[PDB]
Amino acid sequence: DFDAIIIGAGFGGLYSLKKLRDDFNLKVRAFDRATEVGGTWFWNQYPGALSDSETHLYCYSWDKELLQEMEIKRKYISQPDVLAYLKRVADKHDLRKDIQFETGIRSAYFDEENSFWNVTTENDEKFTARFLITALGPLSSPHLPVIKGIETFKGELHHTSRWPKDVTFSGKRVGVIGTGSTGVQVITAIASQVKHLTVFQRSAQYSVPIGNVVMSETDVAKIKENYDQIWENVWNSALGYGLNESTLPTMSVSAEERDKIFEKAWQEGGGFRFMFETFGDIAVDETANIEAQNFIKKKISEIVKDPFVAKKLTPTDLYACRPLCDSGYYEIFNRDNVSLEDVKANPIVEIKEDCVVTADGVEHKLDMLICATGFDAVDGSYKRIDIRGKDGISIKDHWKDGPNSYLGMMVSNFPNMFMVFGPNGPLANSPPIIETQVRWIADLIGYAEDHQINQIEATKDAVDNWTNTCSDIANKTLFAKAKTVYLYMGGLKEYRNQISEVSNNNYKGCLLKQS
Ligand SMILES: Cc1cc2nc3c(=O)[nH]c(=O)nc-3n(C[C@H](O)[C@H](O)[C@H](O)COP(=O)(O)OP(=O)(O)OC[C@H]3O[C@@H](n4cnc5c(N)ncnc54)[C@H](O)[C@@H]3O)c2cc1C
Ligand SMILES: NC(=O)C1=CN([C@@H]2O[C@H](COP(=O)(O)OP(=O)(O)OC[C@H]3O[C@@H](n4cnc5c(N)ncnc54)[C@H](OP(=O)(O)O)[C@@H]3O)[C@@H](O)[C@H]2O)C=CC1
């Protein structure tokens, strides 16, 4: 028996555990397949893995002593250093004693008679808990490309989410399939280390400099002396990235002033910076969006000296969705040991024991093939657990057509289950989102103990109202276009307003059952 069972020991699960156990004095246990805390920062150890947000903001804000203790080595934070940070949090707050590692959760069945959850591990251990906290993260299973013959390759073959230790590059012919955020980081990190790199690019994306530099002790002291204001700015912002979020319309300035503004963001670095600190309508107005595209295309054409390679790297679509950042990606294609293959024009048709074959018949001989090919969507982590709520309905069936929820935290037919960083949540920096949701969920659970409520559930109507709120917001944006509604796009500040109104109005939209 527990008051709460938590699935996941990444950012979301660790704070779920600390808040429910130490601040609300509940009996809690968390579970993770991993052998150690860290979640995605434990699993993803590929070359060049790097935070998207600056080091001093990609962290918890709720422990002020930790903030002052913060190691801030570079402007952005590498995977080993995030993993080390989350280990330090677990150390300081004595968290591991209530985490069962190497334990996958196979099923969780809601017991409507007793109003609690029966949770079964993959080793057939059964646990019961009033509440179920799912902190499963944004990504499901790794997606491997479906390519004829991929199982015949005799060299090294890895998805980036299963990067083995001890990989060496010297003397090897290496291929990378995928040029999203992960592929860009891997390619930039390994091109100088391999004998030859072939990049297999299906769709060129826009990338801006991340500007990752060492942080002086003065840089760090200024941050730490001003940390309360820094966090106040996060809670008052749409993105939580520490940006000066612009309201300036792109076309309201001259051509010369617009170039200076883009160039300032480009030199400072950061994807959200380039998209949202420059001007206020890049994601909203097509004409503004085209000015942003053209600035980046001109940078590509200046960096990449061969115009035919530059052309191949140049996208043909909107500057939209989460912005990409790099530490020297376009420069890589000037190297004599790098080949770019456009596999939209020249598709991969076969993999054999020693090569990737393209449609022109060319055998690209490889010692190593890296699949930076992405992951299944967020709801897959939910559908891969056998979660059965009211009347035995499964989340596979409930979400056949995509995820829908109330506030991103509650699913109709699934009572006493609360999602952390779940679908239909905000587009912002994740740790502020997780802290916002964990604190809301925990206050609701505390309210239920105070008012002797034993079943909490969102109504179908509140879920559908949330879906409409997200749909209305997203349809004012070019993100609705470009490459159920998966995200709420109103920003962190308005998200916190939205959920505060719900808690201030006796949890409108939630069915509360007394006993
Ligand atoms: C290189 C990289 C950089 C990033 N940078 C940023 C950034 O700057 N800003 C940002 O906002 N986001 C960023 N992200 C996104 C990142 O996912 C989030 O920031 C955050 O770490 C997610 O934490 P989480 O605890 O919610 O989920 P995760 O860290 O994914 O943890 C989920 C855990 O649940 C476990 N789990 C799932 N199903 C089961 C089951 N059935 N049984 C047991 N355990 C289970 C998994 O094993 C996993 O350990 C980045 C991601 C990567 C890979
Ligand atoms: N890595 C990071 O630093 C961060 C990552 N994230 C998120 O992580 C998620 C995953 O990023 P990523 O790992 O880059 O995965 P993505 O899904 O973003 O990119 C997948 C890449 O592989 C290509 N690809 C997929 N299948 C094939 C195929 N069969 N043949 C050829 N090419 C193929 C895609 O091309 P096409 O575009 O043509 O499909 C794309 O280039 C994204 O949502 C990203 O925003 C979040 C924060 C930071």
Instruction: Indicate whether 402 and 293 sit together in one domain.
Output: no
Q: Is the CB of 54 under 6 A from ligand 2?
A: no
Local structure of 76: helix, strand or coil: strand
Instruction: Indicate whether 207 and 305 sit together in one domain.
Output: yes
Q: What angle do CA 51, 54, 59 make, to 5 degrees?
A: 80
CB 511 within 8 A of CB 457: yes
Pick the last residue of a domain from 292, 316, 342: 342
Give, for ligand 2, the residue of 76, 202, 206, 317 to mutate: max count of ligand atoms closer than 8 Å to Cβ: 202
Q: How far is CA 135 from CA 122, 293, 302, 417, 424, in A?
A: 18, 36, 44, 11, 14
Q: Which ligand is nearest to the CA of 58?
A: 1
Instruction: Indicate whether 222 and 134 sit together in one domain.
Output: no
Long-range contacts of 179-184 (CB under 8 A, 24+ apart): 179/203, 179/204, 179/205, 179/372, 180/205, 180/324, 180/372, 180/374, 181/52, 181/322, 181/324, 181/325, 182/46, 182/49, 182/372, 182/374, 183/372, 184/324, 184/326, 184/329
Task: Flag whether 175 is in a domain.
Answer: no
Q: Is the CB of 374 under 6 A from ligand 2?
A: yes
Q: Is the CB of 178 under 6 A from ligand 2?
A: yes
Tokens of 465: 């109202």
Residue-range definition of the domain harbouring residue 255: 203-342
Instruction: Indicate whether 259 and 326 sit together in one domain.
Output: yes
Instruction: Indicate whether 421 and 336 sit together in one domain.
Output: no
Q: Is the CB of 74 under 6 A from ligand 2?
A: no
Q: Is the CB of 145 under 6 A from ligand 2?
A: yes
Task: Flag whether 289 is in a domain.
Answer: yes
Instruction: Indicate whether 209 and 334 sit together in one domain.
Output: yes
CA 43 to ligand 1 centroid distance, Å: 9
Instruction: Indicate whether 296 and 389 sit together in one domain.
Output: no
Instruction: Indicate whether 232 and 327 sit together in one domain.
Output: yes
Tokens of 221: 């002291």
First-to-last CA distance in the chain? 19
Instruction: Indicate whether 232 and 123 sit together in one domain.
Output: no
Task: Flag whether 131 is in a domain.
Answer: yes
Q: Is the CB of 323 under 6 A from ligand 2?
A: no
Resolution (Å) of this entry: 1.8
Residue nearest to atom 10 of ligand 2 (CA): 374
- Looking at the chain, the residues that come just before a C–N gap of over 2.5 A are 483
Local structure of 494: helix, strand or coil: helix
Name the burial class of residue 20, with classes exposed (0-12), middle (13-18) and buried (19+) by CB atoms within 10 angstroms of its CB. buried
Q: Is the CB of 180 under 6 A from ligand 2?
A: yes
Residue nearest to atom 18 of ligand 2 (CA): 180
Long-range contacts of 111-120 (CB under 8 A, 24+ apart): 112/390, 115/415, 115/416, 115/454, 115/455, 115/513, 115/515, 116/416, 117/5, 117/416, 117/417, 119/5, 119/31
Pick the last residue of a domain from 326, 342, 358: 342
Sole residue written with tokens 């559930």: 457
The closest-lying atom of ligand 1 relative to the alpha carbon of residue 420 is 26
Task: Flag whether 120 is in a domain.
Answer: yes
Instruction: Indicate whether 11 and 129 sit together in one domain.
Output: yes
CA 9 to ligand 1 centroid distance, Å: 9
Pick the last residue of a domain from 342, 365, 390: 342
Q: Which ligand is nearest to the CA of 40?
A: 1
Q: Is the CB of 121 under 6 A from ligand 2?
A: no
Domain count for the chain: 2
Helices 217-225, 227-235: axis angle to 10 degrees equals 60
How far is the C-alpha of 451 from the C-alpha of 175, rounded, in Å? 60
Task: Flag whether 426 is in a domain.
Answer: yes
CA 329 to ligand 1 centroid distance, Å: 25
List all residues 6 or more positions away from 162 whose beta carbon is below 8 Å from its beta carbon. 142
Instruction: Indicate whether 334 and 386 sit together in one domain.
Output: no
How far is the C-alpha of 57 from the C-alpha of 263, rounded, in Å? 24
Instruction: Indicate whether 131 and 225 sit together in one domain.
Output: no
Query: Between β-strands 417-419 and 126-134, what pairing exists: parallel, antiparallel or unpaired?
Result: parallel
CA 181 to ligand 2 centroid distance, Å: 6
User: CATH number of the domain that 14 lies in?
Assistant: 3.50.50.60
Task: Flag whether 147 is in a domain.
Answer: no
The closest-lying atom of ligand 1 relative to the alpha carbon of residue 44 is 53
Residue nearest to atom 15 of ligand 2 (CA): 374
For this PDB entry, the determination method is X-ray
Task: Flag whether 156 is in a domain.
Answer: no
Tokens of 392: 């035995």
Task: Flag whether 55 is in a domain.
Answer: yes
